Structure 1
């Protein structure tokens, strides 16, 4: 049947406490946002790698005879209400969204 090259794990996250923002700083993630007198809990759908090597040689199916590989998590950016040592603001934060295979040549 069909299976990815890198095994992946997805979960809805409703209790996030810190995240790295687009500018690289660590920021605190607030839990509920009120947008116009009504509140929302902030949720993030994240997908992570289950393993950098789901198989001993790296990613599944790769041609190991020529290639080296491992799986790695890639990120999107989602704006969220956050706060830092001085200011609460909507900021863009890095969220984990996929597990992909990266290759290079064996020598």
Structure 2
């Protein structure tokens, strides 16, 4: 929980129902997964940005004489039991994992 150029929020979500697979196709996330005749909930640990601009100028801490910046969220891939309505399988879906600052050089 270190002071950063971008403010984030993390939480455990055990009810995700909708998602984007690795191929970028939307899919539905099965609520109960059954392993070896044992059924479990699918959990994800997600981290979102609090705002795209923690501060007026963009990300906090930036040398704003020379850059433009903003906070955005990034992804990791986790296997999940999903369905796209055609075939039910395990796919890798995106899960937001961080809020990083992207930069752009100020145009002079």
Specify if TM > 0.5: yes
* Residues 28-66 of structure 1: CA deviation (Å, up to 9, x unaligned): 000111110111100100000001100000001010011
- Counterpart CA distance in 1 for 2:98 and 2:66 is 25
How far off its partner does 1:2 sit?
Answer: 4.8
Q: Provide the aligned C-alpha RMSD in A.
A: 1.3
Unaligned residue ranges in structure 2 (runs of 5+): none
CA distance 1:74–1:32, change in 2 (3 Å): same
Deviation track 1:60-107 (CA, whole Å, cap 9, x = no partner) reads 101001111000000000000001121110001010000000111112
Runs of 4 or more consecutive aligned structure 1 residues displaced over 2 Å after TM superposition: none
The aligned residue for residue 78 of structure 1 is: 78
Residues 100 and 37 (structure 1), Cα distance of their counterparts in 2 relative to 1, 3 Å cut: same
Q: Distance in 1 between matches of 2:2 and 2:23?
A: 38
CA distance in 2 between counterparts of 1:85 and 1:14 reads 21
Q: CA separation of 1:2/1:13 partners in 2, compared to 1, >3 Å: closer, same or farther? A: closer
